[PDB]
């Protein structure tokens, strides 16, 4: 509407890339994160599907997808982590240069910092969904599969919890399946660890718009 009226009232009178590699990494990170998001919700089914399901007929068929998607989610994870770290070092080794006193920064470094912060959060939150479905399944991958597989010993409450916990036909493979979820939880833990301390001396306030636009520059 008001655009037409302007172009009518105005006719009655008559580049360089810019941080190309960087916007690449964050596209990559966004894309990987979305990939992981879809992958996670598929590992979800593949797990609850390995409940019963005609024994080893399909068990091997599923455990083939699981440790395949699992390895991808991991490979995608490590790239995201390396792209993030790379940007951190990139930013850190640019502070002193990208500040011209006045307290102000530089649109380059400002953008880098808001991208770096936002995505690290997006990342920890996605992986937390993963961490949750792994432990969620590992708890019942021992309850309604390993323990309830006491159709061999009449052992009641304690002799099935005091025994199954330590060792852990088809009850032999579920062990290999539990310790998978365990080095999964471990990778994640390791990751969450240096991801948490990685927000230290960063942000606390960066997610606030007002804060970013206060440290803007000027003077051409």
């Amino acid at each position: 509407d008001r655009l037409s009226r302007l172009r009518q009232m105005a006719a009655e009178n008559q580049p360089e890339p810019f941080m190309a590699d960087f916007f690449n990494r964050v596209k990559r990170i966004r894309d990987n994160i979305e990939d992981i998001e879809q992958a996670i919700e598929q590992v979800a089914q593949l797990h609850t599907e390995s409940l019963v399901a005609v024994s080893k007929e399909d068990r091997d068929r599923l455990n083939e997808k699981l440790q395949d998607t699992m390895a991808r989610i991991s490979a995608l994870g490590n790239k995201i982590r390396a792209d993030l770290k790379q940007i951190e070092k990139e930013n850190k080794r640019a502070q002193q240069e990208g500040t011209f006193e006045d307290g102000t920064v530089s649109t380059d470094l400002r953008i880098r910092q808001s991208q770096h912060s936002s995505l690290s959060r997006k990342f920890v939150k996605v992986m937390t969904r993963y961490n949750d479905v792994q432990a969620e399944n590992k708890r019942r991958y021992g309850e309604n599969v390993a323990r309830q597989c006491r159709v061999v010993e009449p052992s009641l409450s304690d002799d099935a919890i005091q025994k199954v916990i330590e060792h852990g036909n088809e009850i032999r493979d579920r062990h290999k399946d539990i310790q998978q979820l365990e080095r999964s939880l471990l990778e994640l833990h390791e990751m969450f660890t240096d991801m948490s301390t990685l927000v230290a001396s960063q942000g606390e306030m960066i997610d606030r718009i007002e804060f970013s636009v206060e440290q803007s520059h000027n003077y051409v």
């Binding site: 009226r5 530089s106 959060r121 606390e204 520059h217």
Partner: protein
């Protein structure tokens, strides 16, 4: 829309997704008024994945970025257009193009100035968003005018400009998409009556213009317009609900609170966080009594830890240094939860800080304040010597000047007429420095009558609903709540609060649904009145929204009133 923050974010989103660019990042060029409004409805993270990569201040504009489209949220003001025609004018343009969204309608004289300058070729899209009100909370709107009270009732009130005020407020109705009946007090100031008249024509000139379309159910959306004088007590009273007590007793500048915790190692790490809608403990806890908050945050924290370990495979047999050792063990064992942890540590802290600040002294002030303001004791024994109530507080030398002022102000509001002599002596006995006394006398400018020789103002004729008030330091209910509930029941006299139009449309028998009730008070709004809009939404009938030129704590309201003559 339910929430004003949702509503404002929707306009931003709908506008950003209308920008017809080539699919690269966008640059959001923003005003001071735009900055404030957008900052309150969206985090940076939410702006990033909306396809903007930076936010910039329309002033300054360094770093030229021709690869990206510039989007401007900005006011129809010469100063701004000069920044726009300037970002292009020169040889190399500053963005691939400009997408101009104006906060309210743009005058023709300015439209021309843009058409003649080079910039014209670059401007793709140009709309009028019709939103210039700060969405402070889901149910609270604000005008970002911290001196509103002064500009409006002060000794320059004559030249206030109620035009820009009416349009700002009508903005509330377009972005909310509702066409309300305007209500005002029979005893409104002339300045206010006129504002209410004009607001009715504004929303109506918007409805016959298709800027808002509604169905108009049996019950009607109303927009209540109030002078600060509706209730001069609520702004002053010590209040024991969480939000209200925090902002009073603690140091909360621009919504930022500071505390101290520990990380992996380094202790006394001073965090500054903003109090806001994206903190789930803040919500849910903010309208609760502080004694109850103290212990639910602790409960919620302990339940969270116990649960978050059972989601993995562990168990809490280790308890060192109480809950601090839980916080250490959680940040070590479940790094994933670092942010929930920061959230609990903030409210553990703030909760505790409030409890500590509510000293026996403050309790004394509160007891006195409640007695004066409800005019009876816990007992029910009517209180008649208002000056006697205050004596206890005013001798007490442990009591802040500001606290004494608050009690004194409440006292002259109750007395409704006190001799020049008895008042000058009360102020002398209280050791209140003469410059600080304008907090008392300036109540005249809000229609109070403080000195007996100025002649008393005819008693406010409105029944109080009467409620069950359990807590003995929380017996006062803001008048505005009674206004809300009466309206949510068509039970509010038309003689007491007339409508601009369709008066008989609020007759009385002797989620996304429900009608809206907007309440706007000139000058200042109080956290206890804010709480009321929430209480009354979740209780009966309407959805309530409350606002003012700004939010003022009791300290800030004392400062404002003292400034009315300066």
């Amino acid at each position: 829309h339910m929430s004003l923050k949702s509503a404002v974010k929707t306009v931003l989103t709908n506008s950003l997704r209308s920008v017809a660019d080539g699919g690269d990042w966008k640059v959001l060029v923003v005003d001071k008024p735009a900055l404030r409004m957008i900052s309150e409805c969206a985090r940076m993270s939410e702006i990033l994945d909306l396809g903007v990569t930076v936010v910039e201040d329309v002033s300054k504009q360094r770093k030229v970025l021709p690869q990206f489209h510039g989007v401007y949220f900005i006011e129809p003001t010469e100063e701004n257009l000069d920044y726009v025609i300037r970002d292009f004018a020169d040889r190399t343009p500053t963005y691939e193009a400009a997408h101009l969204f104006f906060l309210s309608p743009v005058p023709d004289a300015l439209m021309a100035k843009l058409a003649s300058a080079k910039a014209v070729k670059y401007v793709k899209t140009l709309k009028e968003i019709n939103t210039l009100f700060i969405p402070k909370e889901h149910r609270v709107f604000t005008l970002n005018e911290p001196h509103g009270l002064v500009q409006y009732y002060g000794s320059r009130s004559s030249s206030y400009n109620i035009d820009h005020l009416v349009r700002r407020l009508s903005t509330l109705c377009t972005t909310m998409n509702v066409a309300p009946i305007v209500r005002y007090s029979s005893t409104s100031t002339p300045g206010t009556e006129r504002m209410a008249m004009q607001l009715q024509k504004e929303i109506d000139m918007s409805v016959s213009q298709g800027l808002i379309n509604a169905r108009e159910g049996k019950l009607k959306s109303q927009f209540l317009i109030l002078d600060r004088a509706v209730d001069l007590k609520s702004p002053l009273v010590h209040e024991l609900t969480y939000q209200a007590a925090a902002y009073d007793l603690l140091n909360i500048e621009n919504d930022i609170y500071s505390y101290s915790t520990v990380d992996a190692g380094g202790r006394e790490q001073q965090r500054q966080v903003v109090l806001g809608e994206d903190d789930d403990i803040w919500l849910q806890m903010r309208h609760l009594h502080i004694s109850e908050v103290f212990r639910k945050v602790k409960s919620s924290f302990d339940e969270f830890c116990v649960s978050a370990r059972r989601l993995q495979g562990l168990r809490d047999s280790q308890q060192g240094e109480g809950g601090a050792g839980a916080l250490k063990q959680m940040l070590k064992d479940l790094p994933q939860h670092r942010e929930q942890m920061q959230k609990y540590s903030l409210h553990l802290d703030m909760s505790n800080a409030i409890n500590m600040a509510f000293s026996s002294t403050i309790d004394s002030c509160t007891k006195a304040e409640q007695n004066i303001v409800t005019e009876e004791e816990q007992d029910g024994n009517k209180v008649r010597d208002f000056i006697g109530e205050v004596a206890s507080v005013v001798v007490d030398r442990r009591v802040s000047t500001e606290d004494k002022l608050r009690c004194l102000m409440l006292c002259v509001l109750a007395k409704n007429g006190t001799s020049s002599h008895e008042l000058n002596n009360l102020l002398d006995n209280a050791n209140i420095a003469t410059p600080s006394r304008s907090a008392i006398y300036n109540l005249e400018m809000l229609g109070a009558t403080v000195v007996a020789d100025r002649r008393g103002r005819k008693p406010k004729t409105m029944k109080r609903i009467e409620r069950d008030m359990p807590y003995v330091l929380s017996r006062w209910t803001p008048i505005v709540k009674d206004l809300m509930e009466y309206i949510a029941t068509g039970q509010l006299d038309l003689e007491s609060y007339p409508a601009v139009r369709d008066g008989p449309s609020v007759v009385q028998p002797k989620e996304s649904a429900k009608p809206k009730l907007f309440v706007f008070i000139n000058g200042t709004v109080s956290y206890n009145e804010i709480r009321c809009a929430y209480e009354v939404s979740q209780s009966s009938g309407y959805e309530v929204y409350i606002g003012a030129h700004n939010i003022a704590t009791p300290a800030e309201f004392v400062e404002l009133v003292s400034l009315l003559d300066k």
